[PDB]
Amino acid sequence: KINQALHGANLRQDDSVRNLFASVKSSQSSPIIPGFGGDFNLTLLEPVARSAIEDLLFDKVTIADPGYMQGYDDCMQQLICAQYVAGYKVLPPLMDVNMEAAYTSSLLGSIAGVGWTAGLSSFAAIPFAQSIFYRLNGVGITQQVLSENQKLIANKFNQALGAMQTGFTTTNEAFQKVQDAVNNNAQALSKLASELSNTFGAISASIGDIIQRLDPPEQDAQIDRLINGRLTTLNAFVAQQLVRSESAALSAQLAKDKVNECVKAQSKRSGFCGQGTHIVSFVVNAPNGLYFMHVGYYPSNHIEVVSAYGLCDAANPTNCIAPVNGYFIKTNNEWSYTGSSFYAPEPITSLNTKYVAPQVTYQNISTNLPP
Amino acid sequence: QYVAGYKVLPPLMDVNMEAAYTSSLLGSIAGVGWTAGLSSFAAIPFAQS
Amino acid sequence: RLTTLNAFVAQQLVRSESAALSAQLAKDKVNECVKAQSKRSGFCGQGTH
Amino acid sequence: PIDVSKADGIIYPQGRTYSNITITYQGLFPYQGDHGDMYVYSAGHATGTTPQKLFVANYSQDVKQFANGFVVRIGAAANSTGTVIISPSTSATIRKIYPAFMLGSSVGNFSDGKMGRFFNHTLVLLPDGCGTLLRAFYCILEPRSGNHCPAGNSYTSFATYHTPATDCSDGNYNRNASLNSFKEYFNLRNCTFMYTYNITEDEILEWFGITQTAQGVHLFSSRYVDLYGGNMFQFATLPVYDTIKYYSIIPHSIRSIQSDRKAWAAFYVYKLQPLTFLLDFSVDGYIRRAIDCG
Amino acid sequence: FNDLSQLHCSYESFDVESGVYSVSSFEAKPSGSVVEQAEGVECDFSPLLSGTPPQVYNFKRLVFTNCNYNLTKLLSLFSVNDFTCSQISPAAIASNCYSSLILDYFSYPLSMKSDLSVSSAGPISQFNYKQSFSNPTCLILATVPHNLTTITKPLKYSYINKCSRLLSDDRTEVPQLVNANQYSPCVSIVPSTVWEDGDYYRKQLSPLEGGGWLVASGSTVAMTEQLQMGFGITVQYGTDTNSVCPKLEFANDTKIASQLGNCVEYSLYGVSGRGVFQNCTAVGVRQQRFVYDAYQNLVGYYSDDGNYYCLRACVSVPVSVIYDKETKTHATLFGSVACEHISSTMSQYSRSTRSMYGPLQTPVGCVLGLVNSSLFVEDCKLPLGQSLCALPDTPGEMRLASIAFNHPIQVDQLNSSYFKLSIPTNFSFGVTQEYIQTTIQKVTVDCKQYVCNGFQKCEQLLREYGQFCS
Ligand SMILES: *[C@@H]1O[C@H](CO)[C@@H](O[C@@H]2O[C@H](CO)[C@@H](O[C@@H]3O[C@H](CO[C@H]4O[C@H](CO)[C@@H](O)[C@H](O)[C@@H]4O)[C@@H](O)[C@H](O[C@H]4O[C@H](CO)[C@@H](O)[C@H](O)[C@@H]4O)[C@@H]3O)[C@H](O)[C@H]2NC(C)=O)[C@H](O)[C@H]1NC(C)=O
Ligand SMILES: *[C@@H]1O[C@H](CO)[C@@H](O[C@@H]2O[C@H](CO)[C@@H](O)[C@H](O)[C@H]2NC(C)=O)[C@H](O)[C@H]1NC(C)=O
Ligand SMILES: *[C@@H]1O[C@H](CO)[C@@H](O[C@@H]2O[C@H](CO)[C@@H](O)[C@H](O)[C@H]2NC(C)=O)[C@H](O)[C@H]1NC(C)=O
Ligand SMILES: *[C@@H]1O[C@H](CO)[C@@H](O[C@@H]2O[C@H](CO)[C@@H](O)[C@H](O)[C@H]2NC(C)=O)[C@H](O)[C@H]1NC(C)=O
Ligand SMILES: *[C@@H]1O[C@H](CO)[C@@H](O)[C@H](O)[C@H]1NC(C)=O
Ligand SMILES: *[C@@H]1O[C@H](CO)[C@@H](O)[C@H](O)[C@H]1NC(C)=O
Ligand SMILES: *[C@@H]1O[C@H](CO)[C@@H](O)[C@H](O)[C@H]1NC(C)=O
Ligand SMILES: *[C@@H]1O[C@H](CO)[C@@H](O)[C@H](O)[C@H]1NC(C)=O
Numbered sequence A: 001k002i003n004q005a006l007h008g009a010n011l012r013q014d015d016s017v018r019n020l021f022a023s024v025k026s027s028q029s030s031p032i033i034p035g036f037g038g039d040f041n042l043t044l045l046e047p048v049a050r051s052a053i054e055d056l057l058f059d060k061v062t063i064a065d066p067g068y069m070q071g072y073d074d075c076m077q078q079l080i081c082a083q084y085v086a087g088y089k090v091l092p093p094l095m096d097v098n099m100e101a102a103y104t105s106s107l108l109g110s111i112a113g114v115g116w117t118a119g120l121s122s123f124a125a126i127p128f129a130q131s132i133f134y135r136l137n138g139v140g141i142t143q144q145v146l147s148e149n150q151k152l153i154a155n156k157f158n159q160a161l162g163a164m165q166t167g168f169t170t171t172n173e174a175f176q177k178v179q180d181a182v183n184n185n186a187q188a189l190s191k192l193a194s195e196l197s198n199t200f201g202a203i204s205a206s207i208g209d210i211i212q213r214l215d216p217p218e219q220d221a222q223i224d225r226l227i228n229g230r231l232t233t234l235n236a237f238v239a240q241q242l243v244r245s246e247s248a249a250l251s252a253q254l255a256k257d258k259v260n261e262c263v264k265a266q267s268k269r270s271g272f273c274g275q276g277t278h279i280v281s282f283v284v285n286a287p288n289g290l291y292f293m294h295v296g297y298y299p300s301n302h303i304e305v306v307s308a309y310g311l312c313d314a315a316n317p318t319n320c321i322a323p324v325n326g327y328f329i330k331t332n333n334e335w336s337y338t339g340s341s342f343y344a345p346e347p348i349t350s351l352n353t354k355y356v357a358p359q360v361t362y363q364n365i366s367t368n369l370p371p
Numbered sequence B: 001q002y003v004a005g006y007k008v009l010p011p012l013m014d015v016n017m018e019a020a021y022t023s024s025l026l027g028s029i030a031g032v033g034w035t036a037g038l039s040s041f042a043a044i045p046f047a048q049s
Numbered sequence C: 001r002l003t004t005l006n007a008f009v010a011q012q013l014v015r016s017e018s019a020a021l022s023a024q025l026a027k028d029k030v031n032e033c034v035k036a037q038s039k040r041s042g043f044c045g046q047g048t049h
Numbered sequence D: 001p002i003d004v005s006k007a008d009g010i011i012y013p014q015g016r017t018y019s020n021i022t023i024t025y026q027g028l029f030p031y032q033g034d035h036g037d038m039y040v041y042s043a044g045h046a047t048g049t050t051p052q053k054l055f056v057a058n059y060s061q062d063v064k065q066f067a068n069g070f071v072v073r074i075g076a077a078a079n080s081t082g083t084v085i086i087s088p089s090t091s092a093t094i095r096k097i098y099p100a101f102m103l104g105s106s107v108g109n110f111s112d113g114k115m116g117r118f119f120n121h122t123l124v125l126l127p128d129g130c131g132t133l134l135r136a137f138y139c140i141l142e143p144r145s146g147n148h149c150p151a152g153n154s155y156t157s158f159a160t161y162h163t164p165a166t167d168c169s170d171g172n173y174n175r176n177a178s179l180n181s182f183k184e185y186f187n188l189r190n191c192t193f194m195y196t197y198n199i200t201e202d203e204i205l206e207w208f209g210i211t212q213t214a215q216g217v218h219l220f221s222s223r224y225v226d227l228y229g230g231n232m233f234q235f236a237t238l239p240v241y242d243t244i245k246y247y248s249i250i251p252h253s254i255r256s257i258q259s260d261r262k263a264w265a266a267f268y269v270y271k272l273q274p275l276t277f278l279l280d281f282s283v284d285g286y287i288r289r290a291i292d293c294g
Numbered sequence E: 001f002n003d004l005s006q007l008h009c010s011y012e013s014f015d016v017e018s019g020v021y022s023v024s025s026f027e028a029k030p031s032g033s034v035v036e037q038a039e040g041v042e043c044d045f046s047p048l049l050s051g052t053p054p055q056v057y058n059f060k061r062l063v064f065t066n067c068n069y070n071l072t073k074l075l076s077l078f079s080v081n082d083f084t085c086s087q088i089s090p091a092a093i094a095s096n097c098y099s100s101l102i103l104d105y106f107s108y109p110l111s112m113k114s115d116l117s118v119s120s121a122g123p124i125s126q127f128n129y130k131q132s133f134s135n136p137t138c139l140i141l142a143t144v145p146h147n148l149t150t151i152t153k154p155l156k157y158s159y160i161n162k163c164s165r166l167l168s169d170d171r172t173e174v175p176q177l178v179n180a181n182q183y184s185p186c187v188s189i190v191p192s193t194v195w196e197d198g199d200y201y202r203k204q205l206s207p208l209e210g211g212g213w214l215v216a217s218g219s220t221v222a223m224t225e226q227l228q229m230g231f232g233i234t235v236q237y238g239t240d241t242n243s244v245c246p247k248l249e250f251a252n253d254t255k256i257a258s259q260l261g262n263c264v265e266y267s268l269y270g271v272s273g274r275g276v277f278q279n280c281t282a283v284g285v286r287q288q289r290f291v292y293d294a295y296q297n298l299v300g301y302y303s304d305d306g307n308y309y310c311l312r313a314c315v316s317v318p319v320s321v322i323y324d325k326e327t328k329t330h331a332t333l334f335g336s337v338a339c340e341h342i343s344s345t346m347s348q349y350s351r352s353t354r355s356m357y358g359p360l361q362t363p364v365g366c367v368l369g370l371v372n373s374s375l376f377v378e379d380c381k382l383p384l385g386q387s388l389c390a391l392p393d394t395p396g397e398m399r400l401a402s403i404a405f406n407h408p409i410q411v412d413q414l415n416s417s418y419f420k421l422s423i424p425t426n427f428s429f430g431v432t433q434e435y436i437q438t439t440i441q442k443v444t445v446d447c448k449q450y451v452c453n454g455f456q457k458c459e460q461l462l463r464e465y466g467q468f469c470s
């Protein structure tokens, strides 16, 4: 029964991993080269093999190698080496670390391309700078400031991705979650490796010492007590593994949904995967799971201004216009247009508004008529 | 409760400040859901919303 | 008594995990169709929300 | 008061050492921060170089329960200077001395009726030969019946004098002349065993424990293993046949001359109770940090 | 019978599912035993080999318990002339351990040898020394070796030929019989060396001892060319613990350095188990000799050589199996281990291998049954781990391959105004089948009839439990 339960749990883990990696596998991609991102110094994501962020994340987290090359060989001469003393095998992962590297490379070289058109039929590997241009167009920032303010936003994005390397500490809640997940696996194995010393009412934890000290009629009861304790411990471990695997599968489905929503495409959901209005995301592996980081918009230095709901002619009240992805702003340098997330007063044209049905609620105007 | 002996720990949020949270949500939902993008606040009178 | 406390611990952890999942669901709901007007059918309101 | 973080006065595990790990350990330990029952020995009277009548306290009339054993610190005031008990106006260099203990399950009064006399078998540990010898003997104690003697007249207390000119002879003190002072009040009868130990002199702090087990009392020290440490270590397994209920300290005298009244040290006594500690076994495994639970 | 037998009995069927399975492990056999924590002391025979040996009526005693004695180092010192033993084999006293031993040495020439018998009635068998009737004994009549001066020779051999006690009437005479480990009263009046042959010794007896007079007669035989003497050993089996033993001749196979890096069953004088001893550096307290971990498992030990050792475990390798349905094919795998262990040092039941190349080193471990090949499989069915898989041949053994990565269709990110677009020119409709379990089987159970089955005494017993069914 215990072998059946562990085999079923491992098969569930394996095909859940296979399903998640099949879903995240992009159709088409561009090769990763130096100069990726152009002016953006995003080469930390670029792997030159795992990525530098991935290797730094492996280094900064207390991880013991699961003896896949010389585990018994290092046990010949010198916690992972304590694998047989209780009796258990840590299975190797279903995918190679190089297979993870190939998947992460595919996502990093394809995320610039997939994020331009609805539907995954085509692939659109535009240079990364123009991808950011179109994504910031998508959030409601006018093309004038993007045409005029490339250098400062490039420096802002670069320093934003450069600030997180020194933030690799307790403040990163993601590292805290990775750490106690790894600690959860470690203490789950330590439950097996430690409870052998428990006696459960017996006088010694060693069966051989029991048979070498005692007479058979009482060691029958002693061995029975200790094996009953060990079987109850193993049944509790089976239940713990089952509920942990079920939670892992649910989290895997959630991760697949998240990478299918705001990685391959630009989402609009309020803080579903990025606090603030989301712009882009990036994805790497993690020593137990999957690590996500997201770059989003954060406004500052807000100002209050006066605005309307629509411009209508006094002589022709039927002709009414409404702002498209923006607002109608009265400058105090006579109306003008502003974007939905930045203060950029610019003269109102036909390419940013839509003709709309008239109401009393808008403002009649007959002096400075927009085109 | 003490006859057995166990502390009923109070929640981290009091009544008044969590009520202030709910008041902020009530005052914001009139205007936030009018234009995509969470950057700009749009507190129109509620009937127009 | 220790058996009773062990059972209470297990039940409390199960309820805490269920409460955390419901908390995340409530967070998604309140950022989905409270701060905005979701077009999704019946996710948080029968008929057109 | 004893600091467990400073790791003073802790019984080491009896046979089970570790390394570089912080381990919980149940056993017999003193409470954290105890003032204890510190006593000081003093020298007798002296006019110039004439060895006069003794000068001690009323420690002999005091008896306390052995309970779960106790530990003794020696020479915490060494490498320093302090006052003399018999000469409060004079301060001399603080000199370490070792105390003599007597152990018995019985109670009773002396011939004059003063509390403190023990009956039947009695254990005595006396340091002799200027402290180099550690004589230990579990005998029947017979009081003498002379003047100022316990079975005789004018009895006040029994004391052990130490004449530095005679009892000791800077090397030739192996004549146990302070056991003679013990014989000058008491007599040994029907004795089970008689044990001595050799310990060199120094001016460094010392710790030892007198605490027992069931089948036999034990003698623990740091002297045998860690001179620079203070950890208890099993150096003697004394085979008593009964559990000793009460302990007492013997007042000790010194017949030094007046012009050379050396200032003595203070020794500290801490009783032990069954508790649990946390210990920090270092790479060498000696206890250097520990903490209480309760 | 084999791993597949255990796999079949695990599934309670003749048919199983193809895949990777964990079968019970095996253990490398212990190479031997080491016993080195506490050694005993040696028995003393220097007073036997030194000084003037006293006479036959003055046999001097050495008692032996809790000591080591080696007749190879002991009996070689004797110029052996006469050897007799009763109720014990001669080789047993040099080999077998005993509870206690007593050994009396006395002056005894070879001329007076024939009086040493128990059934004899001569003066030696009457007054001087009598053997043990109820205990096995051994008499050795030896000579001083010519190259041996540490023992000396007395003035003359002497013994008592007539010994008796006269009562208060002075007419009734009682001869004195010496028992085993006894002394005659005439020994008290006969000196350690009788002056000459036919000497008569006399003593007055106290009236409370029956009164009367005590008489004895002593006789002398002069020194020969070299002194001859006698040794008597009486063994005892139930008077002590079986402690006197010969040399522990295991100094070349029970030490730590003799069996470095090999699994042994240590018996460390109170501590026994299975493990591997390795030389190390002195850690922890050197005095306690026993250092353990947090989990009460020993990590090292301080031997008497001054060298500290670490003991980790007697560690072995688990065994896993890969099996395929509808192609009766299987192979064995050992993970996390170099290709170093072959079928020699086994345990448990047996091993399974067919179609007799064998050892194959993979990143998972060492595999028996596979074969190295340059194949790439993207739809593997039997995941061996990492990215390695095996594939049946549709009789042909399993083929090793790596998990084939499916490269996405590459497109070059150009650097100009133009752009290279990927567009599909063909399409299909794919059906994707999914199942969502929305309802478990609504089941009830009738508590009392399940737990009780309608017997009245059972419902009498279950009334006190009460609210569990509710
Ligand atoms: C009264 O005054 C005397 C003399 O001033 C003090 O005695 C000295 O105490 C210090 C304590 O730090 C000793 O220093 C220690 O030396 C150890 C090794 O030295 C010994 O071995 C060498 C080689 O044989 C000799 O040359 C040397 O004389 C010593 O015999 C070191 O290993 C010690 O390092 C330890 O440091 C700390 C703190 O002690 C520990 O926690 C570490 O684990 C480490 O083991 C240390 O450096 C010095 O040797 C002593 N000298 C003499 C002559 O005894 C008394 O301590 C002082 N007493 C009081 C109560 O104040
Ligand atoms: C892009 O960012 C990387 C990461 O900081 C910069 O590379 C570092 O340069 C410093 C300067 O000496 C070195 O000390 C670090 O070792 C480098 N780290 C890595 C990971 O290469 C790089 O200079 C930046 N490039 C640009 C153009 O800004
Ligand atoms: C703007 O001109 C329009 C056109 O006449 C006027 O708005 C009307 O106001 C009346 C009075 O309530 C309403 O009944 C009409 O329905 C409104 N028109 C529309 C199209 O809704 C009004 O004169 C002016 N309003 C403002 C605010 O300037
Ligand atoms: C120290 O005191 C002890 C008390 O017993 C003396 O020890 C024995 O003394 C007797 C004399 O009555 C001797 O026959 C024994 O040989 C002694 N035994 C041992 C082990 O010493 C001892 O003589 C005293 N030391 C002195 C006076 O220097
Ligand atoms: C002793 O334990 C500490 C605990 O962190 C560790 O850092 C140190 O490396 C250990 N010492 C040795 C020699 O391994
Ligand atoms: C102790 O010292 C005395 C005298 O110096 C000596 O007779 C005795 O043998 C010593 N004992 C030990 C164990 O060194
Ligand atoms: C054990 O190792 C120590 C240190 O490496 C070395 O000094 C010693 O000679 C070694 N002993 C043996 C028997 O190999
Ligand atoms: C298997 O074959 C491949 C290619 O022929 C080779 O690179 C590899 O080293 C081989 N492995 C073994 C264990 O023979």
Ligand SMILES: *[C@@H]1O[C@H](CO)[C@@H](O)[C@H](O)[C@H]1NC(C)=O
Residues within 6 Å of the ligand: E415, E416
């Ligand atoms: C763009 O690529 C062409 C090669 O087709 C090269 O000649 C040119 O220098 C490149 N322009 C850059 C890197 O700005």
Ligand SMILES: *[C@@H]1O[C@H](CO)[C@@H](O)[C@H](O)[C@H]1NC(C)=O
Residues within 6 Å of the ligand: E425, E426, E427
């Ligand atoms: C599309 O692919 C199918 C599958 O082979 C083929 O039968 C069909 O002719 C293809 N259609 C076109 C337009 O290429």
